[PDB]
Structures are given as C-alpha cells and as structure tokens.
Design a protein around this ligand. Structure first.
Ligand SMILES: CCCCCCCCCCCCCCCCCCCC(=O)O[C@H](COC(=O)CCCCCCCCCCCCCC)COP(=O)(O)OCCN
Ligand SMILES: CC[n+]1c(-c2ccccc2)c2cc(N)ccc2c2ccc(N)cc21
Lengths: 724, 197, 148
C-alpha cells in the first residue's frame, strides 16, 4: 500500500468524522511520517533542477552562444520523459533513489550532444563551412565514439542490477534510471541534434578572454604532453604506485551500508524490572515527559504505557517524540537522543533507550546493529543468560561502541505451588476443586454478551483486586473436605520461589537472545560488527551468533563488491574489444579506473565519509566516465594512426583536438553534482554520500587522464609492436 | 500444488462439523504429494537394548532437526511410533471393586489436569501496589509412578484403591499398527526429501 | 492458561519445526511472553511474492493442527502479512476533562477504529484502548461463607 495516499485517506476520513464528535472531544495526529516522504521528494526535485541549471551554465560558459547551449540542453528533458515512460512500463515507481539516478545522469545525458555541437562549432569556425556541411562532416567524424561511449556507459551499470538482497534492489533503481536515460540521450543526439544544428544555427568581453585563455592553455597542454611522452617508464611506475595506494585505501577504509538521516522524530523505550508495576513505569515516563517539557524543539510527545516493540507487559513503555520543522529546530535528533539518554541514566529505576528511526522503514525499528546470540549446543537458558551478561560486561568497557543493550523482557521471580496430593486424599479434598479454585482465583473469565446502547458488550467476572495482590490471599482460599470443615490452601500447597526468564525467544529454531547496539562516533557499522564478532569469539563454547536486519544486508552488500566491480570492468573491456577490434586498445582504456578510484577514495577520506552502497554506485559511474574520457582520445589517436601518422604524433594530435570535449563533458558532470555535494537541510547526508565520491572521482579522472591515457596508449602499442 | 491444497482445505472445513467426534479430535491430515525423495536414514539396535518407540523418540528429538538444517535438505518424514502413556485395564479386577472403564477415564481426566497460572498485582490493581509477580501451579502428571498412584473410590466397600491395582500402566506407542525391522531387529527410519532447486 | 515455558515447549517449537522448509526463506524467529500469546515471524528473500508466502505458510502449518493444544486449536492460528512500524497515530483527548480515559477509549473503539480500518491501504488498526463491559468483582471470602 502507498503510504502517502493511505495517510491522505485517513486524514480525510478523520475530517468527516470530526463533525459527528461529542462536545469536549478533540482528535489529534501527534505522530505522522507520510509528510517527510513528500518533503524529501520535493527536495530531490529541487536538486535536479539546480543540477540542470548548473549544467546549462557550464555549457554556456564554453559555447558562448544561447542557441549552441540550447541545442544540447533540450535532450535531457526528453530523455528523462522517455525514462519515465520506461519506468511506468516496467513497474518502477518515482522515489528518492530513481530521482537521484536522474540527478546523476543529468550530466551524462548531455555528453553526446555536447560532443556533436562542439565539433560542429569547431568545423564552422576553422574551415568556414555552412551549418549543414559542418554538421555532416562532424557527424561523419564522431558517429563511432558516441556509440562506443553510449554502449560502455549502458553496459557498466547492468551487472549491479543482478545483485542479491536489498542492496540489489537499491542498485536496480539506479541501473534502470541511468541506462535507459543514457540510451535515450544517445538516440536523441544521433537523431535530433544534427537536424537542429543544420536548421537553427546561424552562419558564423568575457568570451574573447575565455577563448584566448583556452587557446593558451591548449598550447601549454600540447607542450607539456610533448615533454611528458619522453618519460614513460617513470609514469608507469607512478601509475603503479597510485594503483597500490588506491587498493590500500579501498581495503583499509571503514565501510557502512547507508547514512543515518534525520526524519524529524525519535523513539524511546522504557524497560523496568520484572517486579515493576504500571505506576512505577508511569513514574519514569512522567520524568521523561517533564525533562522533554519546555524544550523548543519538541512539537508533540506521545507515550504508550504497557506495550513495547520487543514484548508487552506492565513493566514496558514506548514513546514517540516528534521534533519541530528543520528551519525552526536548533538541535539534531541525534543530540536530542543523546541528551535524553544522559538525563535518564542518572535518575531512573529502569533502562531508558532513546533511538533514531531505522535507515529503512521495515528493516528493523531502530538505527544500529542487531545481533542474535544463540545456544547451539543445548547448554541451557541460564547458561545463555550468563553468556549474555559476560558479553554486556565486555561491551560496556569498549570504546568501539556507544551503548549496547538487550531488547527483551528481564529475567524475573516466579512462585510455584506444589500440591500435596497425599494430604488432599487424607483430608478427603477433591483435586478438581483445588484445581478450579486456583485457576479462577486471579483470572478474568468472559461469560456472555449483553446489549449496551445497541452494541453487544462482554460480561467479565473476576476476583476483586484487594484479594489478588498478595500470596496470602490466594493461600487463604478454602475448600470443602469430606469431614465438613473448610481447609485453606496453605495447609495443602507449598510455595517455592525461583528465578526464571519471563520471555522465551528463538532464532532459526534455537534458543536465542536479541541484542542491540549503537556504534560510537568515529566508528562505522562495519567496525562495530567486527569488534562485536571478536568479542563474541571469546564467549564459552556452544554459543553462536547471527546477524539480523540491517546487519545481514550490510554483510551481504560488502561480500559482493569485488565480484561486481570485476564483472563490470570485464564487460566494459569486452565491449571495447568488440567495438575497436583490438585487445590492446581496450587495455589502454582500462587503466583509467585506478585513476578515478584514486580521488574518489581521497574525497571520501577528506570528508570523513564511509564506504557505503552509494559510494559503490559512484565508483561504477566513475568507471564509466573514465572509460569515456579515455575513449574520446584513444579512438581518434588510433584512427590517425591508420591514416599514416606515427604513434606519438597521432596520439598528441588526438589529445590536442579532443581536449575541449573532454573538459566540457567532465565539467558539466562535475557541476551537475555540486548541489548534492553542498546540500544542506533535510536528507543532506544521503546527498553528500552520493555526491562526494563521484565529485572526487570525476575530478581525478579528468585531471589525471589527459596526461596518462596518451602514455598508456603509446606504451601498450609499443610493447605490442615489440613483442609481435 | 499450493493453490490446490488451500482450496482443498477450505472445502474440507465445511464438513468438519458433521464428521464423527473422534475423527475431529484426531484431525484430518492434508498434504501435497512430493517427488523429491533423496535418501533414507535409519537407526537399529543390534543388541535389542532398545525398541522401535525408543529409536523413533531419539530420532525425532536429536536427529531429524539436525538433518533438517543441512543445506539442501527440505522436508524430513519420520516413519515410526510416537511414545504415549498406555493403561491396560483388567476387567476382572475392575469388577472385583465394582468399577468400570468410565470410572478410570474420569479419574484420569480429573487427576491429570492443567491449572491456569496468574499474576499477583495484575491490573486493575489496588492503590499502592508495588510488586507484581507471576504464580503458577502444576496439575499434570509427568511420571509413570504418578499415573500408577492415581486414587479411585471403590463402590463395593468405599475404600480407596490405586489405578495400578486395577490396571497396568506403561510407556508404549500411540498406535501399534505398523512395525519396522532392520535385518529382523527393531528399527526406525526417516525419508529425506530434496529441496527444490 | 500456560506459562511462557509451556507455550514455548508446546506451540512455538512444534510449529517452527514445520516452518523451516518454506520457499525463499531468509530466517525465522519466535517470541513468547507471560501474556499468553506467541508470535512467530518468517522472513523471505527480497523480491518475493508475499501472497504466495502466506499460502505456503498456511499449508505447512495446517499439518500440525492436530498436535496443537485444544485451546489454540479452537481459538485458531492466525496468519497475517507483516508491517513493522506505524504509519500514524490517531488520538482522541478531552481538553476540559469532560470524558475520562475509559469513555474516550470506548468511543474510539465503537465509532472510529472500524471507520479508519475501512480506508483503502490500511492493513491493521491497533487500538490502545478498551471497550466498556460489565465487570463482576467477586469477593472470595464472601461466596465461600454461603458455600458458593
Ligand atoms: C535505445 C533507446 C530506447 C531506450 C529504451 C529501451 C531500453 C530497454 C528498456 C528495458 C527496461 C526494462 C527491463 C527490465 C524489466 C524488469 O522488470 O526486469 C528488471 C530486471 O532488473 C534489471 O536489470 C533492471 C535494469 C534493466 C535496465 C535495462 C535497460 C537497458 C540496459 C542497456 C542495454 C544496452 C546495453 C549496451 C551493451 C527487474 O525485474 P523485477 O521484476 O524483479 O523488478 C520489479 C521492479 N518493478
Ligand atoms: C503411515 C504408514 N506408512 C506409509 C503410508 C501408508 C498409508 C498411507 C500413507 C503412508 C508408508 C508409505 C510409503 N510410500 C512408504 C512407507 C510407509 C511407511 C513406513 C513405515 C511405517 N511404520 C508406516 C508407513
């Protein structure tokens, strides 16, 4: 069911039911999560609009003409509309993931049209040709590179859609929303762009300075490249060093699954001792409400007394605290929860846990790591609880965790009455009478229904409260004997006090205990899980552990990274080999992946961001984009090589001619992701995670490739010629 | 198969009432025929130290679930007899004391019973109540001696007699229809069905 | 009519034995408290049809109805689709204390809960209040005096 529409219907129904409401009764909606969905959607749409505007400005800064800038820009809305049609046909829905995919693709989907228009303008300016002849020549020159780039960038995202688990579902949204949009952009670039260039382009201050500076920079780049090509082995050694650093950073950097986001509300759970009553829990709940009173950042507070998410009873309570709007708020939800926990720890008779909402709606009820400690050797419940206590002792003294606790009802006292059947027989008492008087002593019996104001209502018979509060009242119960005198239960039943669990839990058909924990700041989810595993390894034999909820999905996501990256790289390599009919040309183009992963890792380290799913998606995107920037030079260099020019001359000429398209394309993508990088407000964490890695990787690939891919080409082709 | 089984169960539910009482109490077992048979696992006693019921009990308690959690193992069908508390009543001894089968059944249903546990301090609670504690009682019989010590009242003389006097109580099989022999000795078996895919 | 241990040893384990073996199952778990109820949850792999899962579970759990205790058998074993969290909380309050908690809770149950549950897309409505009823509080020391 759709959350937004269901909430709208509920709010409408409540509106109709308001009219027929007795005076003195008021409806309220203290807790509601539906609005945040639309807020996030509108935020992502605004980010998309900002990215579009920035990309248009970047294109204008280079082309210098409004018509030239419009010709590529028109392709993005049409490609996005086609992508929307494909999503509707395939069953996909509009959500933050698909919209983020569109935001990422907005820079890519203008690359082909940018390449077409740049070549058309260059031909018109240099050769003094008419728009229609210039377009014809440009397309004849650039048909193949566009197809190659499109195929590579469509194939690169395919493998991650075949992943298992929730991470596979996450990757699927980006895969579709990027591949379909890229295909549609390539089709538009090959169909509509030539017609517009031939038809709506007329024959040919800051712009003059930009042009002169760009010619100067092109000359400097040519001279620097000519100097550089002389030194090739040193530049292979440096590339190996960079690859090693990239591998070390990728392997030894903390990993996570999903950034934690502020949704404007947090949760609180109160667990009190087994012997606690409703009044005792109400006392601590009143202290929590008083502490949260007068705080400007709280809109409404609701407490459910007697119910919980990990067991219900008289000693449990749950409260939902809603915060004010982000603009009106002054403190983050995490700080609110930390302050609540600090306040409650000092003065309370039970355990109060303030937590933030989970990363995913149905994947748990809290943000953190969840563990299931299992008794796998039939050790026994008390042994499992002793192991739990020792694990808590180890975990409470560690700096890798903030707070680790148990999400279950505490162990408690039990009273058992042993019946002396021999005494019952001797006194003449009948066992069934004892059985009946004990069973009904302190229980509610539903009997029949009776009409109350037109509704059937229950008749419940129970013993009065004053006679079921202490064991003495039960032991005072009397039964009739054969001789005639009444005999109290105390004469015939012996009470026994024991310490036993009040809740029984099982995971995968074994005795189990649920544990929750919050990693400390500067510690990621993966680090906390590894440390918890190490601590568990020290527990007595016969005790095992399982990862459930978010933890299992995170482990599965981390397990599949290497295979996915390798398969994507192999697919791109095979596509390039098919397109260019060589095993060495793809090899040169495959050496830029380290150049981008260097820079992606650097950006995430500089900003202190973890390796998460969005980082992996950015890595795949950077693989595709670096393959594009290598192809843009390598294709033309090879073609000039068959024309008759030498390897070095052809490569240098190709780099000199293709500098401008590469810089334009790379800068368009880079500026298209700044809004994600510098996003502020609500949902900013996800935008930062999705944007920082791609930003760094694109910068590194653009700056480093222009000097490395020519050397890769020359070195590989020379080695191939030498060996064979 | 699932959609046939659910339809069949739903249609059976209509006539569940008109069926004989004992059939209802036993229950109607609905299953879907499976063809993913993989192997058979059995246990045998060369020295006859154990019987078929004991072997089946051991297999179900300590073997079947172990095999079920092996990768690729789906359903496990144990063939054998489940243990039960069997009372064999001698009519001559019963008539000696002027007792009948119905009296023995009533005594068993009376002495062996479940007592509902409760909570002291449960809501609604008297003001000032601080301690709430569960309280339970045991009425069921879990040992052979306890069943043998059940007390009946003799009508002929009014004296108190024990169930063991008029009957022999033991631990046997719920049903004795089938027997399994491994090379002419008591044995039990369980068929392992391969999981799909 | 049973403790947590008895329910675990009679209902939870007996059912969970057969639960193990359904198609596309990630894991299963069970919980029992002193409230007289037991909750088993089966989690299936992502991208799985919930409707097929419910019927498969129902088929696999009806093979043990006979061995299940009589009270559970007559009350029934309830199978449902899972919704982890709350979409929203709808509350009624008395600004001037005109109506007490019991009255508000009765009105919510008898005029609001059913209306809300019929809204399209609503899966489950959990009311945290109780309807009114006729309560008979019996004094144990009194009826014994009259022999009742
Ligand atoms: C040329 C211009 C025209 C472009 C437009 C046409 C492009 C083809 C469009 C096909 C898109 C739908 C294909 C997938 C349909 C589908 O439901 O299967 C999915 C398989 O996973 C997936 O793989 C999802 C991603 C699939 C992306 C396919 C888009 C083409 C990729 C590039 C092809 C070119 C390669 C170049 C070498 C998910 O299945 P589910 O049922 O479990 O999920 C249910 C969620 N609603
Ligand atoms: C429970 C009887 N029953 C049946 C059976 C009989 C009638 C209907 C369904 C199954 C059975 C059916 C097949 N194919 C193979 C072995 C056995 C079996 C084996 C041992 C046993 N002690 C009872 C057995």
């Amino acid at each position: 069911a759709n959350a937004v529409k269901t909430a709208e219907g509920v709010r409408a129904k409540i509106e109709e039911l308001k009219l027929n409401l007795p005076e003195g009764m008021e409806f309220s909606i203290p807790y509601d999560t539906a609005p945040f969905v639309k807020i996030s959607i509108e935020k992502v749409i605004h980010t998309l609009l900002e990215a579009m505007v920035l990309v248009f400005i970047v294109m204008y800064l280079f082309l210098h003409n409004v018509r030239y800038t419009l010709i590529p820009a028109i392709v993005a809305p049409i490609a996005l509309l086609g992508t929307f049609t494909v999503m509707l046909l395939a069953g996909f829905s509009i959500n933050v993931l698909t919209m983020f995919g569109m935001v990422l693709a907005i820079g890519i989907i203008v690359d082909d049209a940018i390449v077409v228009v740049e070549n058309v303008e260059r031909i018109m300016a240099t050769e003094g040709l008419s728009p229609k002849d210039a377009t014809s020549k440009a397309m004849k020159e650039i048909t193949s590179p566009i197809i190659g780039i499109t195929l590579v960038l469509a194939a690169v995202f395919l493998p991650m859609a075949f992943a298992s688990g929730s991470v596979g579902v996450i990757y699927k949204q980006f895969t579709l929303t990027m591949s379909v949009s890229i295909l549609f952009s390539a089709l538009l670039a090959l169909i509509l762009t030539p017609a517009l260039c031939a038809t709506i382009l007329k024959p040919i201050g800051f712009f003059a300075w930009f042009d002169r500076s760009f010619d100067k920079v092109t000359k400097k780049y040519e001279l620097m490249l000519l100097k550089i090509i002389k030194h090739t082995v040193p530049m292979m050694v440096i590339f190996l060093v960079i690859t090693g650093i990239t591998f070390a950073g990728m392997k030894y950097w903390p990993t996570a699954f999903m950034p934690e986001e502020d949704q404007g509300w947090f949760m609180t759970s109160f667990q009190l001792p087994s012997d606690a009553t409703a009044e005792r829990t109400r006392n601590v709940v009143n202290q929590f409400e008083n502490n949260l009173k007068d705080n400007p950042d709280v809109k409404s507070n609701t407490a459910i007394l007697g119910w919980g998410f990990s067991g219900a009873g008289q000693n449990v309570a749950v409260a939902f605290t809603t915060l004010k709007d982000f603009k009106e708020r002054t403190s983050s939800a995490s700080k609110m929860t930390s302050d609540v926990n600090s306040s409650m720890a000092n003065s309370t008779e039970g355990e109060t846990m303030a937590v933030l909402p989970p990363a995913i709606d149905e994947l748990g009820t809290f943000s953190g790591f969840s563990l299931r400690l299992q008794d796998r050797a039939n050790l026994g419940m008390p042994a499992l609880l002793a192991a739990q206590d020792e694990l808590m002792a180890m975990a409470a003294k560690n700096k890798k965790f903030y707070m680790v606790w148990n999400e279950g009802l505490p162990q408690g006292d039990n009273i058992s009455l042993k019946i002396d059947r021999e005494k019952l027989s001797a006194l003449g008492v009948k066992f069934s009478d004892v059985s009946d008087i004990i069973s009904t002593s302190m229980g509610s019996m539903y009997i029949n229904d009776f009409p109350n104001q037109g509704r059937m209502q229950q008749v419940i018979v129970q013993v009065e409260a004053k006679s079921r509060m202490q064991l003495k009242d039960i032991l005072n119960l009397k039964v009739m004997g054969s001789s005639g005198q009444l005999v109290s239960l105390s004469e015939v039943v012996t009470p026994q006090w024991n310490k036993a669990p009040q809740q029984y839990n099982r995971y995968n058909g074994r005795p189990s205990l649920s544990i929750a924990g919050i990693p400390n700041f500067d510690t990621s989810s993966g680090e906390a899980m590894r440390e918890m595993e190490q601590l568990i390894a020290k527990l007595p034999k016969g005790i095992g552990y399982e990862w459930t909820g978010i933890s299992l999905q995170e482990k599965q996501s981390e397990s599949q990274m290497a295979f996915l990256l390798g398969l994507s790289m192999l697919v791109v390599f095979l596509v390039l080999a098919a397109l260019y009919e060589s095993w060495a040309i793809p090899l040169s183009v495959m050496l830029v992946v380290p150049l981008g992963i260097f820079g992606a890792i650097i950006a995430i380290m500089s900003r202190g961001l973890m390796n998460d799913v969005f980082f992996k998606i950015g890595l795949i995107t950077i693989i595709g984009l670096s393959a594009k920037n290598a192809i843009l030079i390598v294709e033309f260099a090879k073609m000039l090589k068959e024309e008759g020019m030498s390897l070095i001359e052809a490569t240098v000429a190709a780099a000199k001619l293709r500098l401008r398209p590469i810089l334009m394309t790379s800068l368009a993508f880079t500026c298209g992701v700044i809004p994600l990088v510098i996003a502020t407000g609500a949902s900013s964490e996800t935008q930062h995670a999705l944007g920082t890695g791609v930003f760094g990787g694109m910068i590194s690939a653009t700056i480093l490739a222009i000097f490395f891919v020519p050397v890769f080409f020359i070195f590989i082709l020379g080695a191939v010629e030498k060996l064979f | 198969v699932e959609m046939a089984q659910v339809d069949v169960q739903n249609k059976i539910k209509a006539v569940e009432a008109r069926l004989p009482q004992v059939v209802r109490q036993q229950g109607l077992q609905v299953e879907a025929s499976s063809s993913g048979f993989l192997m058979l696992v059995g246990i045998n006693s060369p020295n006859n130290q154990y019987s078929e019921v004991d072997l089946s009990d051991y297999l179900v308690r300590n073997v079947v679930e172990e095999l079920k959690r092996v990768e690729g193992v789906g359903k496990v069908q144990s063939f054998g007899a489940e243990k039960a508390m069997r009372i064999w009543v001698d009519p001559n001894k019963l008539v000696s004391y002027g007792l009948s089968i119905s009296d023995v059944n009533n005594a068993i249903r009376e002495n062996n019973v479940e007592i509902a546990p409760g909570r002291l301090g449960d809501l609604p609670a008297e003001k000032g109540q601080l301690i709430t504690i569960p309280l339970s009682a045991q009425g069921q019989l879990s040992s052979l001696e306890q069943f043998k010590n059940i007390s009946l009242k003799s009508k002929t003389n009014g004296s108190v007699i024990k169930l063991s006097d008029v009957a022999n109580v033991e631990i046997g099989s719920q049903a004795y229809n089938f027997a399994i022999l491994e090379n002419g000795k008591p044995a039990t078996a369980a068929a392992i069905q391969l999981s799909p895919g | 009519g049973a403790t947590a241990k008895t329910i675990n040893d009679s209902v939870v384990t007996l059912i969970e034995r057969e639960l193990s073996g359904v198609k596309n199952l990630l894991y299963y778990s069970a919980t029992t408290d002193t409230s007289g109820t037991a909750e088993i949850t089966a989690t299936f792999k992502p991208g799985t049809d919930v409707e097929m899962a419910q019927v498969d579970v129902q088929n696999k759990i009806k093979a043990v109805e006979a061995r299940l205790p009589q009270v559970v058998r007559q009350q029934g074993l309830q199978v449902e689709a899972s919704s982890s969290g709350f979409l929203m909380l709808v509350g009624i309050n008395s600004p001037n204390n005109q109506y007490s908690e019991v009255d508000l809770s009765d009105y919510l149950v008898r005029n609001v809960v059913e209306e809300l549950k019929r809204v399209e897309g609503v899966g489950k409505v959990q009311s945290f209040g109780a309807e009114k009823a006729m309560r008979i509080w019996v004094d144990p020391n009194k009826l014994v005096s009259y022999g009742l």
